């Protein structure tokens, strides 16, 4: 069956694979070393160490689980799917879950930073470490809950001619067009638009209030660092995840009569692009930490 074949040249495949492996080593090393750094730490920074830690985790997972599977079955061999039903559902579930976790962690970091720069005297009277860990757990669980629909949206289908050819066994939405549009819309709003709009607003307010504070010790230095970092994280998240959601909307909103061979090949090269950006997002955070902070850089190099 040559109907499930994706027409992308070997050049793009090798290139994307190379970029993928680079982001793999840089990302995994960066995030793992980040975790180990936050482990041997020793006070709101100690809380943002949890958040950061969480983020690292949310990256590592995607780098250690999502990347190999996606490389193989989504870049190198589009059919048949080789990880079964549980792999099919679990993949997308993990994807969405980690996305939600990352976004919520970003917004939470925005709020915590705001409280850090506006009411530091009320902030030192701190939400305890235990309550912070509880909040991280709450974020993760909420992310899983919001990722639930992927367990029922995706599955295995035999898209071969007779529907009996083992090579036609692919991982795909096992749901009609309209409902798919619905869950994709929900994910686009809740994992991207809404929390990043909130985070961007909060970061603008953070910038302004930082300016006001400057106009009013090492607390100012660390605060400014946190501001620039968080800004960079929000911007990077938006930029990296923007084309991704556009593609998934493109997947279900284009009618059958409009789908040409051009739009097909383009869809898959665009898949390469958007997902490459996704892994860029998966590898960006530890790089930013090393640039802005001399300390974290020294400890990062202490491990390595």
């Amino acid at each position: 069956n040559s109907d499930l074949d994706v027409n992308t040249d070997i050049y793009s495949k090798v290139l994307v694979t190379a970029i993928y492996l680079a982001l793999f080593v840089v990302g995994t090393v960066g995030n793992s070393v980040t975790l180990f750094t936050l482990a041997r730490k020793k006070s709101l920074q100690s809380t943002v160490d949890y958040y950061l830690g969480s983020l690292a985790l949310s990256d590592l997972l995607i780098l250690l689980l999502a990347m190999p599977v996606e490389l193989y079955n989504f870049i190198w061999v589009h059919h048949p799917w080789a990880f079964g039903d549980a792999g099919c559902r679990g993949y997308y579930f993990l994807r969405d879950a980690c996305t939600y976790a990352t976004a919520l962690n970003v917004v939470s970091l925005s709020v915590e930073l705001y409280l850090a720069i506006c009411h530091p005297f009320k902030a030192k009277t701190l939400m305890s470490r235990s309550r912070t860990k509880k909040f991280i757990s709450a974020i993760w669980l909420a992310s899983a809950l919001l990722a639930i629909p992927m367990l029922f949206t995706m599955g295995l289908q035999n898209l071969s001619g007779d529907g009996t050819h083992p090579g036609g066994l692919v991982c795909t939405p096992i749901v009609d067009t309209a409902t798919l549009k619905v869950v994709i819309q929900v994910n686009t709003f809740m994992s991207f638009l809404f929390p990043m709009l909130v985070a961007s607003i909060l970061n603008t307010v953070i910038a302004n209030k930082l300016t006001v504070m400057v106009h009013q010790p090492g607390r100012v230095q660390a605060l400014r660092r946190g501001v620039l970092v968080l800004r960079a994280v929000v911007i990077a998240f938006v930029v990296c995840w923007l084309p991704y959601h556009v593609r998934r909307l493109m997947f279900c909103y284009i009618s059958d009569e409009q789908w040409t061979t051009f739009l097909f090949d383009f869809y898959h090269y665009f898949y390469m692009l958007t997902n490459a950006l996704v892994y860029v997002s998966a590898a960006i955070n530890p790089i930013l930490y090393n640039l802005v902070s001399a300390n974290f850089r020294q400890v990062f190099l202490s491990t390595l």
């Binding site: 109907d3 589009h78 789908w259 097909f264 898959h268």
Partner: peptide
């Protein structure tokens, strides 16, 4: 045809 990979 239509893509099957989301």
């Amino acid at each position: 045809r239509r893509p099957y990979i989301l």
